[PDB]
Write a protein that binds this ligand. Structure first.
Ligand SMILES: COc1ccc(C[C@H](N)C(=O)O)cc1
Ligand SMILES: [Zn+2]
Length: 866
């Protein structure tokens, strides 16, 4: 498979302006008729090159003339000797039932549905399957009425009819030109939740949520969240919905989360269905965020689209920024910020050190579906947030407005977006643009000096980015570096210099620079990189007491949590070294006392307290280390939990009890209290065994919501408590028919600390609730093993690697997109010791040798083995 390069972009030789589709739908054989209106822009001698995959061509006509000047080639239909303007008619056949890759038109249970992003429309018909070709669609769907009573496409219904033999049809039209990746079709039998939203200006929009029969009891939160998204986008961004109907369809078989198809979003049912007995607080907030995200794409992705796929972050960084701002405004901003920074530092930084490292605007891609990444998404959003930090809200919104003014109805680039922000704000972003083209994580080193004679405080700040596997050359970035300086009473020292205030966002633009601040009347405790102001590693030689000071005094909740993380990081490192030497956990008394203080502080928001009391995950821990020792990290995480459980036992139990709530509500204050209570229960579970067993089994049985029941269950598994097997079996017996609920259980199984975990996981491939045909089940059993139990996955015997190879041998043929997500933990081999690295290399070499290796895996394996 040959790579494609960003620098190779050229405008298309032909455009399509209008496409009329007809589908004669049947799961074994669907016939597609596509009538396109095309215009040649290039040279008269250049052929029309259409993309297509696994299509059976029936006929090709040009202005109703059966055409002879064409040829099929790999991936393509090449049509020669065309007029400047013409009607193209293609008829072709496709097989939805055969589509196990879930790309194009496929089956989800008994429903037929589509996934077209990035390049799935070419699995439906021969087309210009590139996002700078925007066309007006009309879609006619013909099908069996009993099997497919609902026939859905983008837009509004324009025509409807009934035919003989029990067939009927519906035709849709969407007035807004779109790239084909935003085409959708759904056919099936559903329950339908119907509601309305009226826009600020008075447009009434019909809201329709399509769910499998018998799932309406699980649909109201998603509808609520849709309406909240619509309202928020009006309030915050000034953006209203632009069509008459908003349809969402929840499907059980879907490789990703959800898809922003215009007016007809298609969602993984995981990100729609919730009721208090089936879904946790986190599930509710994820549904909220994903419903928001897809809605927000209506402007940032649909009304303004991407010129080419290398501009994916244009829509995805910006839409993730918007989903984060939505969740943060409606809920806890500090909890959101903290979790997004957890993701950045613990997952995204690992990608940016890996063989798959790329800038947020990639330069080279083999399989575009491989570039829907933590980088493009989460680091993309940090890049947008940095523009917000440099511009401020008012100017950022001026930029958004200029962006839409300029680019509405078109496909644009990252550069276009940055230009709009520059022009609207008058802030120069020329240097800042390097964030789009340079990969890797910057390391920012800070030294300080306080001169009591002059009352000056000097920060010496340096930056460098290590070379990455993709780029041997690195240059300094424009790093917005926010600070705050605290005196001895915990008061903020005004920043100034030469008689003038100094903005607290320092512009760190050089490899090394100094910043001097005057009238600094007391040696400061600095808070550095406030609200994680740039996506960088910070190196500052913190004392423990500076960190516990910030935990008590810092004005922003984020900085209190970040200080806590720095305090723990020293001790995590210490204790992984100790584990390697066979020595027990060591923790200073003063460190435990800091966490005691957080537990007993009546002033602190319980939402913040819960996050300070949630230890970094094994993935966050691994980023502290050049070479990862995954057994040490897992065992130190457990031992640190057990140490704090012993040292804080009375305080944990008192806070656990104080935060008991007898009413369950999905409301942010209630969620906060519950997250704190359950953070205490986690430590209590690793305390004295009989008390732990009693507390956990009682919570499990007495819980009136899944949040609390799962928190107990998860604690029983993590602490290997006596009640574990009984509780695990009770859950299975109650919920085995409900795959989304069983996914939680599969995750618990795959992440168990138990010595025979892999044997249990392999046995669960035969479980009644497991199937290799369903991406969510795969993710929850196999993905969770490989990605979230790096201790068992990295068992010294190599057994974890071999297991994954067998699963990937299946999945390469069945569903390469899922396979490619699942290979990720093997491509991180260079972070492990030599013996592990040799085993992981041999696993990659076995996969490189598969017959019919997918492009998706080929790209990752070749980079990993370089
Ligand atoms: C291969 O199938 C998909 C690829 C991408 C997505 C993400 C969606 N655009 C979003 O950003 O939510 C969805 C599906
Ligand atoms: Zn998106």
């Amino acid at each position: 498979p040959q790579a494609k390069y960003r620098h190779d972009y050229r405008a298309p030789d032909y455009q399509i302006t209008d496409i009329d589709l007809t589908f004669d739908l049947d799961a074994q054989k669907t016939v597609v008729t596509a009538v396109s209106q095309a215009v040649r822009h290039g040279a008269s001698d250049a052929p029309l090159r259409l993309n297509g995959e696994d299509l059976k061509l029936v006929s090709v006509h040009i202005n109703d003339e059966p055409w002879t000047a064409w040829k099929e080639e790999e991936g393509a239909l090449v049509i020669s000797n065309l007029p400047e303007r013409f009607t193209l008619k293609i008829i072709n056949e496709i097989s939805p039932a055969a589509n196990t890759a879930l790309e194009g038109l496929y089956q989800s249970g008994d429903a037929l549905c589509t996934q077209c992003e990035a390049e799935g429309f070419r699995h439906i018909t021969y087309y210009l399957d590139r996002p700078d070709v925007l066309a007006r669609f009309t879609t006619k769907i013909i099908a069996d009425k009993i099997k497919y009573p609902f026939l859905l496409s983008n837009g509004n219904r324009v025509a409807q009819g009934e035919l003989e033999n029990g067939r009927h049809w519906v035709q849709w039209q969407d007035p807004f030109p779109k790239p084909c990746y935003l085409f959708a079709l759904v056919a099936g039998d559903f329950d339908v939740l119907r509601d309305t939203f009226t826009t600020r200006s008075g447009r009434e929009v019909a809201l329709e949520l399509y769910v499998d029969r018998g799932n309406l009891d699980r649909a109201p939160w998603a509808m609520t969240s849709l309406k909240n998204s619509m309202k928020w986008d009006e309030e915050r961004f000034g953006l209203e919905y632009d069509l008459d109907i908003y349809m969402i369809v929840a499907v059980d078989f879907f490789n990703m989360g959800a898809m922003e198809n215009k007016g007809l979003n298609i969602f993984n049912s995981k990100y729609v269905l919730a009721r208090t007995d089936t879904a946790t607080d986190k599930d509710y907030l994820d549904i909220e965020r994903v419903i928001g995200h897809e809605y927000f794409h209506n402007w940032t992705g649909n009304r303004v689209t991407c010129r080419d796929w290398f501009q994916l972050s244009l829509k995805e960084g910006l839409t993730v920024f918007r989903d984060q701002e939505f969740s943060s405004d409606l809920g806890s901003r500090a909890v959101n910020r903290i979790n997004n920074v957890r993701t950045m530092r613990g997952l995204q930084f690992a990608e940016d050190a890996s063989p798959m490292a790329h800038p947020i605007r990639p330069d080279m891609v083999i399989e575009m579906n491989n570039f829907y990444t933590l980088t493009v998404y989460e680091k993309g959003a940090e890049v947008i947030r940095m523009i917000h930090t440099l511009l401020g809200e008012e100017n950022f919104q001026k930029g958004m407005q200029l962006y839409f003014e300029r680019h509405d109805g078109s496909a644009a680039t990252c550069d276009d977006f940055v230009q709009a922000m520059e022009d609207a704000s008058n802030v120069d972003l020329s240097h800042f643009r390097r964030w789009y083209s340079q990969s890797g994580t910057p390391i920012v080193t800070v030294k300080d000096d306080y001169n009591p004679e002059t009352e000056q405080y000097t920060l010496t700040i340096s930056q460098r980015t290590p070379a990455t596997p993709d780029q041997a050359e690195k240059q300094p970035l424009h790093i917005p570096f926010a600070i705050e300086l605290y005196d001895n009473e915990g008061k903020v020292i005004p920043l100034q210099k030469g008689g003038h205030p100094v903005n607290s966002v320092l512009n760190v633009t050089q490899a090394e620079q100094t910043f001097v601040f005057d009238n600094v009347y007391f040696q400061p405790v600095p808070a550095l990189l406030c609200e994680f102001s740039a996506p960088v590693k910070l190196e500052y030689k913190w004392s423990d007491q500076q960190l516990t000071f910030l935990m008590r005094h810092a004005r922003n909740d984020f900085s209190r949590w970040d200080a806590a993380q720095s305090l723990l990081a020293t001790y995590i490192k210490l204790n992984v070294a100790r584990h390697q030497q066979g020595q027990p956990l060591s923790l200073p008394v003063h460190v435990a006392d800091a966490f005691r203080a957080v537990l007993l502080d009546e002033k602190i928001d319980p939402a913040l307290a819960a996050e300070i009391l949630t230890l970094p995950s094994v993935n966050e821990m691994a980023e502290l280390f050049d070479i990862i020792d995954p057994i040490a990290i897992a065992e130190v995480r457990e031992a640190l939990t057990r140490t704090l459980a012993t040292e804080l036992a009375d305080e944990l139990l008192a806070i656990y009890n104080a935060n008991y709530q007898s009413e369950y509500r999905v409301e942010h204050e209630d969620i906060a209290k519950r997250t704190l209570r359950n953070a205490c229960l986690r430590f209590l579970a690793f305390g004295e065994t009989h008390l732990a067993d009693v507390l956990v089994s009682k919570q499990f049985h007495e819980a009136n919501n899944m949040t609390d029941a799962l928190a107990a269950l998860s604690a029983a598994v993590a602490a290997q408590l006596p009640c574990r097997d009984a509780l695990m079996q009770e859950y299975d017996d109650k919920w085995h028919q409900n795959g989304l609920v069983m996914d939680k259980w599969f995750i618990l199984q795959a992440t168990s600390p138990a010595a025979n975990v892999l044997e249990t996981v392999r046995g669960l491939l035969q479980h009644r609730s497991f199937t290799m045909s369903n991406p969510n089940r795969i993710r929850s059993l196999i993905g969770a093993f490989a990605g979230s139990n790096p201790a068992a996955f990295h068992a010294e015997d190599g057994s974890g690697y071999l297991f994954l190879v067998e699963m990937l041998t299946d999945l390469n043929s069945r569903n390469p997109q899922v396979a490619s997500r699942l290979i990720e933990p093997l491509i991180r081999l260079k972070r492990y010791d030599a013996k592990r690295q040799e085993k992981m290399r041999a696993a990659l070499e076995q996969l490189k040798g598969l017959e019919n290796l997918s492009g998706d895996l080929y790209e990752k394996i070749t980079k990993a083995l370089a």
